[PDB]
Amino acid sequence: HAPNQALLRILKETEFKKIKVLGSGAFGTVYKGLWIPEGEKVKIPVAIKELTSPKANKEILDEAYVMASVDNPHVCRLLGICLTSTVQLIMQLMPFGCLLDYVREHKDNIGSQYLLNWCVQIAKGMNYLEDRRLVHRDLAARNVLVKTPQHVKITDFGRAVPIKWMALESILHRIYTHQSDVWSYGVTVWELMTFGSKPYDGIPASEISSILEKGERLPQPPICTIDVYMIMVKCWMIDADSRPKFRELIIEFSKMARDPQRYLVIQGDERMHLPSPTDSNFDDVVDADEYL
Numbered sequence: 682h683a684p685n686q687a688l689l690r691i692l693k694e695t696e697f698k699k700i701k702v703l704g705s706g707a708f709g710t711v712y713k714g715l716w717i718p719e720g721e722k723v724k725i726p727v728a729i730k731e732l733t734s735p736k737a738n739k740e741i742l743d744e745a746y747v748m749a750s751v752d753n754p755h756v757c758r759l760l761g762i763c764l765t766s767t768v769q770l771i772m773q774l775m776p777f778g779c780l781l782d783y784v785r786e787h788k789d790n791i792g793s794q795y796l797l798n799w800c801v802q803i804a805k806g807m808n809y810l811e812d813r814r815l816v817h818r819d820l821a822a823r824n825v826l827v828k829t830p831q832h833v834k835i836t837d838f839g840r841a842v843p844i845k846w847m848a849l850e851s852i853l854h855r856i857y858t859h860q861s862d863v864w865s866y867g868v869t870v871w872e873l874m875t876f877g878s879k880p881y882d883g884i885p886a887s888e889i890s891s892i893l894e895k896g897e898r899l900p901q902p903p904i905c906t907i908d909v910y911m912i913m914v915k916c917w918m919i920d921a922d923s924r925p926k927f928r929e930l931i932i933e934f935s936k937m938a939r940d941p942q943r944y945l946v947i948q949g950d951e952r953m954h955l956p957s958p959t960d961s962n963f964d965d966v967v968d969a970d971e972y973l
């Protein structure tokens with residue numbers, strides 16, 4: 682058990698300025714924003730999460746405790762906090778949002794190259810969380826954020842219940858493990874391969890435990906060769922050590938992403954194209970990942 686040497690950064694409310702609401706949900710309000718620090722001549726695009734009961738402040742700072750301890754190119758990092766009346770969290774801006782709404786609203790351009798890279802990247806992030814002995818407990822396509830369409834990161838592990846993503850031993854005994862995240866990674870891939878479909882759609886979350894104990898699982902997407910679906914199926918096995926480890930999910934999908942059309946059959950997948958750093962895409966603005 683090594684000493685967590687993460688630096689926690691305190692920001693002034695006047696160094697950054699909000700710009701627009703990204704989502705006034707139940708938790709509170711998330712804003713697109715710009716952060717202009719000190720006299721550094723840089724503007725970092727950020728997101729800002731604000732919610733003053735003392736029950737909440739302890740939680741928003743425990744979440745911030747975790748998100749300050751991670752550093753990986755496929756996991757979202759905390760940039761800092763702001764100590765106003767309620768605590769504000771300042772994270773890197775992922776301009777394209779959750780992957781779940783990105784695959785729904787762009788399915789007509791998602792070729793097999795992206796789907797398999799995303800599968801690699803998510804696995805790389807989860808394998809980092811394995812090295813950091815960190816169990817996500819809520820991997821899903823909504824908890825993946827799209828910086829660029831070829832760069833996604835895992836978020837929302839402030840809980841380190843959504844039954845349909847949960848492993849079997851997570852529903853009957855609330856046993857959560859790295860090898861239970863593999864199952865949620867499986868449902869997450871299933872989400873990507875069905876371009877945003879709802880798992881076990883229509884079924885009440887009650888019967889999901891029976892369904893799985895008999896031996897039923899999620900369907901095989903059309904675009905999915907048996908090579909891919911075999912992976913998703915191995916994630917959903919009863920015995921947990923029989924499921925793949927994330928460093929294997931990395932290796933497998935890496936093979937498949939070399940010949941993407943051999944494993945995902947998408948009609949039109951050859952001239953699809955997604956927005957990517959080419960002439961358009963993007964005054965003194967720098968990305969957070971290059972500001973250290």
Ligand SMILES: *[C@@H](F)C(=O)N1CCC[C@@H]1C(=O)Nc1cc2c(Nc3ccc(F)c(Cl)c3)ncnc2cc1OCCCN1CCOCC1
Pocket residue numbers: 703704711727728729730770771772773774775776777778779780781782822823824826836837
């Ligand atoms: C899907 F689950 C989802 O999140 N959706 C669906 C559309 C909007 C909303 C979304 O993407 N919001 C969003 C959040 C962030 C975050 N979130 C965050 C979590 C925790 C925390 F502590 C902080 Cl400080 C912030 N961080 C970074 N960037 C974003 C960007 C987001 O939305 C991107 C822009 C909207 N998007 C979707 C609609 O059409 C245009 C693009």
